């Protein structure tokens, strides 16, 4: 056991030992991006691959070519912190080495000159942070990985619904990674059809003709030939004995001196037995048999040269004669069979209006570009471009794999484009499938759903960026002169940079981070989506794709999906799941060779799992790893049942591996209804982090894995001992074994301090190690928001009691002790960025001066001389943050107002008050001011105060770094210099800087001292550069938008306690809005005097069936028990042996757990530090499905001297009298969801109004009004509320005149409305009237 483990060990129940541990939870997001931006010296996906796809770019046969060499990423213009304050994107510039070649005119390719334009710049591509987010406009965004239909071929049904006859149709769809869609589909008549993209339907033989296939060859392609000989005289037929299966004779079928079947008896196996084994290849047939047969090839009259019968036409009995007498011995006909080999292509050719390649090419072109006339030069080139040009079409390797695999080919790899055989083989399968052999696939199997991510999707966007610079490159190469132009005058960066920018900025797969909370982050990054480009839209797809599918087992979570418009269109990655080599979903299993369960783990893609037999996670095995039971519940081919011991091939890796990170954090989940769990894992991410991080007494174990893997914490790079622990930073003196040879050094972690999140919440880290403490690699040096000692603490545990409380927890409401709001525990800190913008109006420029018209001297008191409030000043709503004044001249005043100007003699201002003022209702402390001034405007007074302070502050940071980093280097010079020449006291008398001169005898230590000097003088010099840069960033003229001259951002630290209206919930889908904040005295207290913190209604438990929340409240009660028991022995100060006796008892508890613990923990410092962290309650781990059992829960309650029933007798603090029946009390972890009421509350008497529709719009001051929709109108109609309705849609909204005749009448004291006509209808007059329609109002 380790160090942040010696502090606080969670007692974990559960039998099943974890064979595999949780992977790095953000792998999807970081591994994907890694491959987009990375020199990959091969064809693998990347920025390299997108380049090689469109490069080289040659001119229109001009023998002038522009090729690609290499690309580089610069360092970002600002750091991630600066990009958020300033408002910019965290991105790196893309420098791409190009080569321009010009070949000699009419000569064998040799270059006249070639200009190697060094790194032409094409756009900045955004960069992904250490944690998988992007900053796009000072806003953290995550790009959700996408689930689309896999590229390749896919055969669907379309059963039933088509044409109301049943029958079912069959479609094959060739779906590529890029390029046009090629669909083959049947019809009610068994005629074959093709449609490119989703265009018009065309007879499916046209695309074969366009591939240069004659009518004769197509027939030759899809049918076997039935040979008809005219031997001796009058009709024979070459017979395959197998041909007669499924048919009955039409005549005496006699051959070989033995009549096998007479006329009318169906040919069965006995007849095929006889014909086959007696080896009858030729027989005799009547002249009437070929009355319907379809002729295969063409035949002409030999002498005359005239056409007798065309290919694909049905012979008649006289037509037989018409070519029999013309000298034709053989006749080829088709093998047509409605059951076995259907005559589809034969009859399809008769619906085909075309006849040759050029004819087919034309009908394709005119279907694709209709209305406009086709050319031979166009019809040939368009068709070649749709599926055969390496540029306009590519399956990718994922497509060619799924393609060839589904056609039962052997290659997993091949052309990126379609060949003659590719297209034909798909038709050959779709026809075979209708013929009865073969099965369709299904859209919803996760082996035909595929997972993109950021890196892949970005590559596609940068691809589309190049294609539009390809158009421009060739455009210029059309005209170019020689040595004048260079690969720079051609390439335009704004089109490339805005394209890639639009992706990370605004995509249905790129979103905000609505609230900080290490689950929200980590669950968003593991999110999947079937939406956006390449996928379906909400309304297009029904419930079949949204549903949970047997493939989801261990790949996608069945529980954590949102409710609403895209249920099942999201999902979240299963814990142990992984993206396939090709991009499918794989899940871990354990190989079962014969009857032993191995620990060799195999990850199985969706298609792979189907054949095997996988055991269940809850399977009892012991000794050699034999299944204890004779037979185990297993799932194999799509479903689960009991199976034979020595027959299973695999076993689940973990009891968890079905659920997601969000689901895997719900304790006693197996006890919670799947409806309320979905809501549970949905509200869990919505927890705004609390002022003081608690830690869940009732936990599941994943608390560390979620906390650690999202960067909100600060984890040890290398192990060592703490040199210095500030509230600001942390210095770890690295251990030699983990320390690098040169430079030596110490790992220094600068902690994040109170800084703004993606609105409006805060993110602040705290050190969790004390001075001179040993840390190892992977320890938590500093918790973040909602982390305590390295565990996910999204809220705080509350002593809670289930009982009705005078209806103050009526529906699902919550009644809370004042002790909770006294203890500041559900307090929450928010940092709002409020900006102030001095712009450029046509009337003039705006000032930031602290001279404001018509405000008292006390109004300006909080302001400084320059007009900006002081740092640290506590402000409330209305207060002036930045005094700003805008020009408005020639006021055009009224008579009476001018008389007021002459009486009290006030110099009427040319300027209007536009100061940034604190929003009404909100209140907090100013903790930051930033000023960005457009380059050229002189930095004002306070702005220069800030520049000096920021400059001097950053000089302290950079130099404190150097000061600590010189010591760590020089300190190891001391150790190396002393070894072999020890001058213990003699050395540290001469100046320390003078040590570099001292050499050493023949040894590698002289090479080590040389190593440290090298990396020392760079630490000397890398300081100098890192200081200059931070200076240049502060003093540069901050680039602004048009018209804006300077901006002042004030950052407010609002501390928001808890109050009636705040939404709160535990982890089991138990919502609730706190309803009354109550005195500690009225709180139900127990016989001990200890009140309760929250009074929950019991009625919200049965109907809305979240039973796990109760076991939570009982095991939470036992957890607190063991805490107060430790707290007894600790305030009684027994001894380590008395403590260790009881602690060791609690960590064992029950039977057959996977825990194991101490006696080895060193008898003093260790046992005592552990007990202290437990006095608040002993944290417990209920695994997700390997959870604690009632007994182990009741047995923990006994150990704590608490009742097994988990219920006690409670007393009403009001009357003092006892409560009949025992109520439940215990500790339930409860969250605060960021639906805080002082955000949700809005009012508006009169406000602003929109220009076009004189309707309430809501900007500054009193907000927008409430919408009163059609359904609310019916309500008033169902009442008699005629007037209430009229005023609701006249004076109270659209009536520009009555609305102020109302406001004046209200203050006058006359509750009348003088209506008039809404503007909506008055505009409809002018809108109808400004069409050709005369609309009037009649009569009087």
């Amino acid at each position: 056991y380790s160090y942040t483990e010696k502090k606080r060990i969670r007692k974990d129940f559960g039998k099943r030992p974890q064979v595999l541990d949780v992977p790095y939870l953000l792998s999807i997001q970081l591994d994907s991006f890694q491959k987009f931006i990375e020199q990959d010296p091969e064809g693998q996906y990347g920025l390299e691959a997108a380049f090689r796809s469109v490069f080289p770019i040659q001119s229109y046969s001009g023998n002038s070519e522009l090729q690609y060499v290499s690309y580089r990423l610069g360092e970002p213009v600002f750091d991630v912190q600066e990009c958020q304050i300033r408002g910019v994107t965290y991105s790196a510039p893309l420098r791409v080495k190009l080569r321009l070649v010009i070949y000699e005119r009419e000569a064998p390719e040799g270059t006249v000159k070639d200009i190697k334009e060094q790194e032409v710049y094409m756009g900045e591509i955004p960069l992904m942070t250490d944690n998988g987010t992007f900053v796009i406009n000072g806003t953290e965004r995550v790009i959700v990985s996408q689930l689309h239909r896999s590229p390749g071929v896919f055969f669907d049904s379309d059963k039933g619904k088509t044409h109301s006859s049943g029958k079912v149709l069959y479609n094959a769809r060739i779906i590529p990674y890029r390029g046009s869609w090629l669909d083959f589909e049947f019809d009610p008549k068994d005629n074959l059809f093709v449609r490119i993209d989703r265009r018009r339907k065309l007879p499916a033989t046209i695309i074969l003709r366009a591939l240069n296939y004659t009518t004769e060859q197509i027939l030759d392609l899809f049918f076997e030939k039935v040979i008809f000989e005219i031997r001796d005289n009058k009709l024979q037929m070459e017979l395959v004995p197998e041909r007669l299966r499924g048919e009955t004779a039409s005549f005496d079928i006699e051959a070989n001196g033995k009549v096998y079947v007479e006329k009318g008896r169906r040919i069965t196996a006995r007849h095929i037995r006889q014909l086959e084994k007696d080896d009858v290849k030729l027989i005799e047939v009547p002249v009437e048999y070929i009355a319907g047969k379809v002729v295969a090839k063409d035949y002409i009259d030999e002498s005359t040269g005239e056409l007798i019968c065309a290919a694909n036409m049905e012979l008649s009995l006289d037509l037989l004669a018409k070519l029999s007498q013309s000298g034709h011995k053989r006749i080829e006909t088709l093998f047509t069979n409605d059951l076995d080999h259907g005559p589809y292509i034969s009859e399809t050719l008769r619906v085909d209006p075309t006849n040759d390649r050029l004819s087919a090419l034309v009908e394709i072109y005119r279907m694709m570009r209709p209305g406009e006339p086709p050319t031979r030069e166009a019809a040939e080139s368009l068709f070649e471009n749709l599926f055969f040009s390496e540029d306009r079409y590519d399956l990718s390797a994922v497509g060619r794999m799924k393609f060839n695999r589904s056609l039962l080919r052997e290659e997993i790899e091949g052309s990126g484009i379609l060949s003659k055989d590719d297209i034909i083989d798909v038709m050959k399968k779709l026809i075979d499938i209708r013929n009865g052999k073969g099965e369709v696939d299904d859209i919803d199997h996760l082996g035909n759903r595929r997972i993109r991510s950021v890196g892949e999707m970005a590559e596609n966007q940068f691809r589309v960026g190049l294609v539009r610079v390809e158009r421009a490159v060739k455009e210029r190469l059309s005209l170019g002169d020689l040595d004048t132009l260079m690969p720079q005058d051609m390439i335009n960066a704004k089109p490339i940079s805005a394209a890639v920018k639009e992706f990370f900025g605004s995509s249905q797969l790129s979103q905000f981070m609505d609230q900080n909370n290490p689950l929200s982050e980590i669950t968003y990054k593991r999110r999947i989506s079937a939406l956006g480009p390449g996928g379906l839209t909400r309304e297009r797809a029904g419930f079949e794709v949204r549903d949970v599918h047997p493939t989801h087992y261990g790949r996608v979570c069945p529980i954590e999906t949102p409710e609403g418009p895209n249920i099942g269109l999201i999902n979240s990655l299963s814990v142990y799941a992984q993206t396939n080599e090709y991009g499918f979903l794989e899940t871990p299993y354990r190989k079962v060779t014969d009857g032993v369960v191995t620990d060799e783990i195999h990850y199985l893609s969706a298609i792979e799992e189907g054949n095997y037999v996988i055991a269940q996670a809850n399977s009892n095995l012991d000794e050699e790893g034999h299944f204890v039971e004779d037979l185990v519940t297993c799932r194999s081919k799509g479903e689960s049942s009991l199976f034979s011991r020595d027959q299973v091939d695999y076993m689940d890796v973990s009891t968890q591996q079905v659920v997601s990170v969000g689901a895997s954090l719900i304790p006693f989940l197996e006890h919670d209804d799947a409806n309320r769990a979905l809501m549970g894992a949905n509200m869990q991410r919505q927890a705004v982090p609390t002022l003081r991080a608690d830690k869940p007494l009732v936990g599941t174990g994943m608390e560390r894995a979620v906390a650690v893997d999202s960067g909100v914490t600060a984890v040890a790079k290398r192990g060592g001992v703490v040199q210095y622990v500030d509230a600001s930073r942390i210095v770890i003196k690295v251990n030699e074994d983990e320390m690098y040879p040169g430079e030596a050094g110490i790992d220094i972690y600068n902690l994040t301090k109170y800084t703004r999140s993606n609105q409006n919440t805060c993110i602040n880290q705290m050190p969790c190690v004390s001075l001179g403490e040993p840390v190892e690699r992977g320890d938590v040096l500093a918790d973040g928001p909602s982390t305590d000692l390295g565990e996910l603490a999204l809220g705080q545990n509350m002593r809670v009691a289930f009982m009705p409380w005078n209806g103050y927890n009526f529906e699902d409401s919550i009644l809370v002790s004042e002790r909770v709001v006294q203890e500041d525990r559900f307090t929450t800190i928010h940092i709002q960025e409020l900006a102030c913008v001095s712009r450029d109006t046509k009337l003039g420029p705006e000032e930031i001066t602290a001279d404001i018209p018509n405000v008292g001297e006390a109004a300006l008191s909080k302001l400084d001389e320059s007009g900006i409030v002081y740092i640290g000043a506590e402000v409330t709503g209305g207060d002036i943050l930045v005094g700003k004044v805008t020009p408005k001249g020639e006021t055009q005043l009224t008579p009476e107002e001018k008389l007021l100007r002459a009486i009290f003699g006030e110099k009427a201002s040319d300027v209007k008050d536009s100061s940034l003022r604190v929003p009404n209702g909100v209140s907090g402390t100013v903790i930051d001011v930033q000023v960005f001034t457009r380059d050229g405007v002189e930095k004002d007074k306070r702005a220069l105060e800030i520049e000096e302070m920021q400059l001097k502050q950053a000089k302290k940071d950079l130099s404190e770094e150097l000061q600590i980093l010189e010591a760590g280097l020089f300190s190891r010079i001391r150790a190396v210099l002393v070894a072999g020449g020890v001058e213990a006291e003699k050395l540290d008398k001469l100046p320390r800087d003078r040590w570099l001169e001292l050499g050493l005898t023949d040894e590698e230590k002289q090479n080590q001292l040389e190593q440290l000097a090298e990396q020392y003088d760079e630490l000397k010099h890398e300081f100098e550069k890192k200081l200059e840069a931070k200076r240049r960033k502060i003093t540069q003229g901050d680039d602004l938008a048009p018209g804006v001259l300077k901006i002042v951002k004030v950052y407010l630290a609002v501390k928001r306690r808890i109050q009636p209206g705040d939404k709160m919930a535990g982890r089991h889908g138990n919502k609730g809005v706190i309803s009354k904040i109550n005195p500690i005295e009225d709180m139900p207290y127990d016989e001990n005097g200890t009140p309760v913190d929250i009074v929950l209604n019991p009625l919200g438990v049965p109907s809305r069936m979240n039973i796990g929340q109760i076991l939570e409240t009982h095991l939470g009660m036992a957890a607190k028990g063991i805490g107060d028991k430790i707290n007894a022995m600790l305030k009684q100060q027994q001894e380590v042996a008395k403590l260790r006796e009881f602690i060791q008892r609690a960590y064992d508890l029950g039977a057959d757990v996977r825990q194991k613990v101490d006696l080895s923990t060193f008898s003093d410092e260790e046992v005592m530090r552990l007990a202290e962290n437990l006095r608040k309650g002993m944290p417990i781990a209920t695994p997700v499905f390997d959870g604690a059992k009632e007994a182990e829960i009741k047995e923990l309650l006994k150990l704590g001297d608490l009742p097994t029933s988990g219920q006690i007798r409670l007393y009403d603090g009001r009357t003092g009298e006892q409560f009949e029946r025992p109520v439940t009390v215990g500790y339930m972890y409860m969250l605060k969801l960021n639906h805080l009421v002082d955000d949700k509350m809005h009012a508006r008497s009169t406000g602003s109004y929109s220009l076009v529709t004189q309707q309430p719009l809501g900007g500054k001051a009193q907000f927008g009004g409430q919408r009163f929709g059609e359904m609310e109108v019916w309500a008033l109609e169902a009442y008699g509320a005629a007037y209430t309705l009229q005023e609701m849609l006249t004076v109270k909204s659209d009536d520009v005149n009555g609305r102020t005749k109302m406001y004046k009448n209200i203050v006058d004291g006359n509750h009348q409305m003088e209506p008039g006509m809404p503007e909506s209808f008055n505009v409809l007059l002018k809108e109808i009237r400004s069409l050709g329609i005369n609309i009037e109002l009649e009569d009087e």
Binding site: G807, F810, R1221, E1272
Partner: protein, 600 residues
């Protein structure tokens, strides 16, 4: 109009109007240039096209707007903007919203309005009422007063607030009860306080739901809100003359706990002068809330020609029902409370009060039923622990038995005795039966197994366990849901619609395992989707329904007809699926109805 940064925005019509003008002007030129007809014909065609894209773009080739891929919004689209586009809604002055919370202290006709919301909402009333009394010289200072929130504006706000109702509206406004008018009560904090009885009408939980507020400005709207939309003027649903202001849950548990009786309790057998001394016996710890007890009560009955005849007796009741009688108003029989009072019986109690005593005595009744219901429900200490969900001892027995039958149905299938379609069908039936067996096994145990003793050996009664009382009363919980906690929870359906032939043998008091929970998932997700979609289909129905009605109004007094439909009880196959008294109550007869004999 210009925007910030000096950038401009304009309606798309200007691209459309500009083009028509340009092509018209160019055509006017092409005539004075006497151009060849080949050109002017092409110009005329473009002028035709330009006008068409202005009036209704989309019925040709759909012109695109300048430099932007999107098409331009034509005049025709100014009117739509697809279907039902002029009646989507309009934002309104004098309004607001926030999260709503309880407030059980409220009378039926009131609601808690935040200090802050009521300030901003009535701003023009305060401004006037401020200088109407002279606390402000003029309106300009009046603003600066309520901006300063001087202590006196608060006392003024009560003046404007008193007889001035406000409107409350919750999200999906289904029937007319979705907007109800209440009298405002000035409350601290930012939450809206909602009377718990009107929750049922609104379909409001307190799990984060919000409501909106509106101010009746004109005198009419205040009287309309008071006489038509008031909370207490709509206590019956207009869909079925029954009360929509039923006690919901927390309260019906309270009354069911009161009007209950246990076999041997403190006070068993004493005789009390009246209901008053019965509350005195309970609040002093002498008599138990549920003990069989004779008390002298007086009840009233208006059997006279509109007059309350009194009758006094020693009725055979309990102590709790005695105390509840102190609330029942005047002319109701003591029999109405003498029973066990579940949500079933507790609403019909409320209905009869309206049909017998009238509106006002019903309103003040419902209040007292909630106050007392909440109080004694809170006194009850009703909770819910883990041991409250009692699994039958015979559960594992039933499972193995049906687990045996299926092993035999399988035995028959192996030998070709029974078909695969029969097997799947026959196996589902024995599992369906076993679930019914476990179900009414746990309910047999759960309901009555409280075996107690009175002066003698034994005697058992309806249980007093927490989770049973919740269901038996009707407050919360349903036997279908309870069955999923103690007994096994049903057979689940696999995605395609089949029901899975091995049901979920385990329940929620035990754990479900990976396989069971994974199968429980599809039902849950299709549950959330089905209930999400059927919330849409309904809303499209009420649209189609008001679109065919809307204009229909009670216009004439009596059309004067004898035509009418013959009303009978539905009597569906077995017995009366709906009585006659329900189908015919509240309707007016077409002609004289006669006894079994006539002349009469």
């Amino acid at each position: 109009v210009p925007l910030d940064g000096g950038r401009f925005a304009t309606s798309d019509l200007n691209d459309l109007y500009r083009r028509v003008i340009n092509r018209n002007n160019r055509l006017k030129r092409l005539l004075d240039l006497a151009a060849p007809d080949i050109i002017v014909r092409n110009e005329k065609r473009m002028l035709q096209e330009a006008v068409d894209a202005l009036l209704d773009n989309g019925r040709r080739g759909r012109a695109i707007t300048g430099s932007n891929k999107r098409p331009l919004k034509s005049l025709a689209d100014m009117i739509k903007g697809r279907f039902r586009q002029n009646l989507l809604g309009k934002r309104v002055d004098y309004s607001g919203r926030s999260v709503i919370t309880v407030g059980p202290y409220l009378r039926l006709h009131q609601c808690g309005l935040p200090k802050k919301m009521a300030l901003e909402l009535f701003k023009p009333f305060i401004y006037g009422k401020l200088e109407l009394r002279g606390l402000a010289t003029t309106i300009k200072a009046a603003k600066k007063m309520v901006e300063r929130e001087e202590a006196v504006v608060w006392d003024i706000l009560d003046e404007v607030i008193r007889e001035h109702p406000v409107l409350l509206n919750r999200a999906p406004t289904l029937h007319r009860l979705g907007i109800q008018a209440f009298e405002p009560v000035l409350i601290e904090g930012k939450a809206i306080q909602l009377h718990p009885l009107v929750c049922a009408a609104y379909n409001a939980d307190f799990d984060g739901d919000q409501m909106a507020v509106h101010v009746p400005l004109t005198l009419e709207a205040q009287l309309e809100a008071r006489a038509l939309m008031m909370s207490t003027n709509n206590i019956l649903s207009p869909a079925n003359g029954e009360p929509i202001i039923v006690p919901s849950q927390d309260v019906v548990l309270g009354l069911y706990y009161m009007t209950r009786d246990c076999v041997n309790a403190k006070g068993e057998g004493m005789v009390l002068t009246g209901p008053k001394e019965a509350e005195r016996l309970y609040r002093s710890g002498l008599a138990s809330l549920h003990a069989r007890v004779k008390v002298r009560i007086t009840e009233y009955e208006k059997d006279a020609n509109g007059e309350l005849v009194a009758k006094t007796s020693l009725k055979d009741t309990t102590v709790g029902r005695a105390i509840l009688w102190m609330i029942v108003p005047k002319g109701l029989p003591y029999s109405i409370v003498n029973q066990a009072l579940g949500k079933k019986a507790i609403s019909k109690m409320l209905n009869t009060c309206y049909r017998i005593l009238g509106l006002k005595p019903t309103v003040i009744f419902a209040d007292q039923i909630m106050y007392t219901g909440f109080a004694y429900a809170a006194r009850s200490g009703a909770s819910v622990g883990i041991d409250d969900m009692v699994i039958p001892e015979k559960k594992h027995e039933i499972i193995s038995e049906a687990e045996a039958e299926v092993a035999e149905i399988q035995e028959q299938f192996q030998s070709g005795l029974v078909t695969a379609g029969e097997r799947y069908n026959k196996v589902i039936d024995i599992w369906a039966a076993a679930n019914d067996r476990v179900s009414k096994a746990m309910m047999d145990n759960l309901q009555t197994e409280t075996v107690i003793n009175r002066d003698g050996q034994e005697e058992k009664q309806v249980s007093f366990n927490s989770i049973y009382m919740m269901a038996d009363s009707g407050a919360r919980g349903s036997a279908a849901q309870i069955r999923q906690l103690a007994g096994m929870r049903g057979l689940m359906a696999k995605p395609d619609g089949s029901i899975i032939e091995t049901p979920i043998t385990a329940n929620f008091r035990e754990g479900l395992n990976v396989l069971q929970y994974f199968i429980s998932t599809h039902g849950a997700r299709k549950g959330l989707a089905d209930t999400a979609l059927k919330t849409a289909n309904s809303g499209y129905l009420t649209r189609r329904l008001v679109d065919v009605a809307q204009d229909l109004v009670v216009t004439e007094d009596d059309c004067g007809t004898h035509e009418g439909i013959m009303m009978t009880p539905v009597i569906e196959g077995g017995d009366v699926k709906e009585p006659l008294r329900d189908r015919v109550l509240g309707r007016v007869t077409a002609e004289d109805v006669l006894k079994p004999g006539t002349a009469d």
